């Protein structure tokens, strides 16, 4: 279980939690199949394994792994409109009358409800972690929206979830810019070959760099021209590489082969064994990487306007 | 109608072409609804005009507008796979055995056969303009594949279609790079604020700029550093604007208001009348734009006979 995206949240109180108290709490807001006239359903499901007996929560060295599945019937607006048109055409030919705006919007609703039951279902899962030992909650997403849903749904299956989005002392963009400007980042981090530079005004310029030597005079000119680094490729030690933007979102999280081949040797031949070891070696790697990141970004922060 | 993209094709020989002769032929290759067990269909349709007796070709002077429609069933690979992991369970909890490679492979074909008929349909169009008195066929698409699909069905429908994609005497990328470098484009063309730059060497880099002044030291330094212009946002005269790539694909085609408004003031009250006017005017301006484009790019590389 190697996360691909990371969104860090601070446990403000690190209030106690039990594997049993949690597991049955998550059952109250579980995942159910989407009804025939239902657009969407959101609820927790078994992270690993699955099968009406598989646990919603998963533990290892005091680390928990939960997951919230979402079901939504796929009914593209494209399909609706084509169906609308065909019906309208049918009425005007068979009833010899013109169907106007008001009535077509009415027939639209009628069409949506006739098509839903026939709409395939899309299943998307949003994994999250809870390391009370680290005092944080880690979501495997890039979308803050999706992260809110997971946390907002966990907020119901708990009644109380004291958590705030990670925040750093110094604005990231300033820290990222400095790193590229000076061609050196905080201890152990390495500026890779990708970034996104941009002017500060809204309709300002935007420059995207792939496979670029970020130490070239070319990049420098963008910086002295006013552009700021809003996205940056970074590696940490020799453990993993990822992309960091100016909202602290960790995207394209990729752990090195050495670490993957490693953890894969703590599960041996079975599936649940291989997964458990991965979520473990990852969480353990996160224990040293995450704090080092906070220090790299110039110390973590604690807000006031709760 | 106003094209949103443009790929040009040169007729390497004279095309017989009689309106009704062409209209007849396209009917032999007309669009048809998707069979409940069918994946996709592809054929011609009335570019303008609804009803089953609406013409497949629209004539304005010596310009012929045609259209190909593709119908496709929405079978998200996602739903096809999710169906198995559900089919397998039943078998394994009742037949004291595991499901293997060739078995699952079989069950997949049966799932498809069952789900296809229930799938919603997605329809998409591609308009093509045939200008005999110019020896060109203009396809309203950014994708060369889409165009080849239109040209192939047209060749199938007509018996033969002697055309080759446009090519010019000087490497486009060299010309586009030269325009940015010298800060001057060839007559009536203007360099806008967007471009894609890329290294000459293997796995080299890519720099994408938008809302950027291409005359700034930043862009200049990228070029002296070796980057080539592979895509450039341009305006022609005061009539249109577009993005030109190094494969000669004319993308994001946009016509100026005074031009579109003029087709409205010449088209009347009815839609079809508007559609005819804009189609006419578009072709009329293309007839000025295209040759000036070829010349600007160093002249067209004319395909020689034997």
Swiss-Prot record, chains A, B:
It comes from the Bacteria. Disulfide bonds: none annotated. The keyword DNA repair does not apply. It is found in: Cytoplasm, Nucleoid. GO terms for molecular function: double-stranded DNA binding. Its main location: cytoplasm. Keywords: Cytoplasm, DNA recombination. One of its GO terms (cellular component) is bacterial nucleoid. One of its GO terms (biological process) is DNA recombination. Belongs to the RdgC family. May be involved in recombination. This is Recombination-associated protein RdgC. The gene is rdgC.
């Amino acid at each position: 279980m190697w996360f691909r995206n990371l969104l860090v949240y601070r446990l403000t109180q690190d209030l106690q939690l039990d594997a049993d108290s949690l597991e049955k709490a998550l059952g109250e807001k579980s995942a159910r199949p989407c009804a025939s006239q239902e657009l969407t359903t959101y609820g927790f499901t078994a992270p690993f394994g699955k099968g009406p007996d598989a646990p919603l929560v998963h533990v290892s060295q005091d680390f928990f792994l939960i997951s919230a599945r979402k079901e939504e019937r796929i009914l593209p607006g494209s399909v609706v409109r084509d169906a609308l048109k065909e019906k309208v055409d049918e009425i005007e030919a068979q009833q010899m009358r013109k169907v106007y705006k008001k009535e077509r919007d009415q027939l639209k609703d009628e069409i949506v409800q006739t098509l839903l039951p026939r709409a395939f279902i899309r299943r998307s899962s949003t994994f999250a972690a809870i390391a009370p030992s680290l005092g944080l909650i880690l979501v495997d997403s890039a979308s803050a929206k999706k992260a809110e849903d997971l946390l907002s749904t966990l907020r119901e299956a708990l009644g109380s979830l004291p958590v705030r989005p990670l925040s750093v002392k110094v604005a990231p963009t300033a820290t990222l810019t400095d790193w590229v400007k000076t061609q050196e980042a905080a201890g152990d981090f390495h500026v890779l070959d990708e970034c996104e530079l941009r002017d500060t005004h809204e309709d300002g310029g935007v420059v995207r760099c792939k496979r670029q030597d970020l130490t070239s005079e070319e990049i420098q000119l963008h910086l002295t021209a006013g552009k700021l680094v809003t996205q940056l490729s970074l590696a940490w030690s020799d453990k993993l590489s990822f992309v960091l933007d100016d909202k602290l979102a960790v995207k394209r999280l990729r752990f090195e082969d050495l670490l993957q081949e490693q953890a894969e040797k703590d599960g041996g031949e079975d599936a649940l064994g291989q997964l458990d070891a991965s979520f473990t070696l990852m969480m353990l790697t996160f224990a040293e990487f995450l704090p080092a990141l906070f220090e790299a970004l110039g110390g973590e922060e604690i807000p006031q306007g709760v």
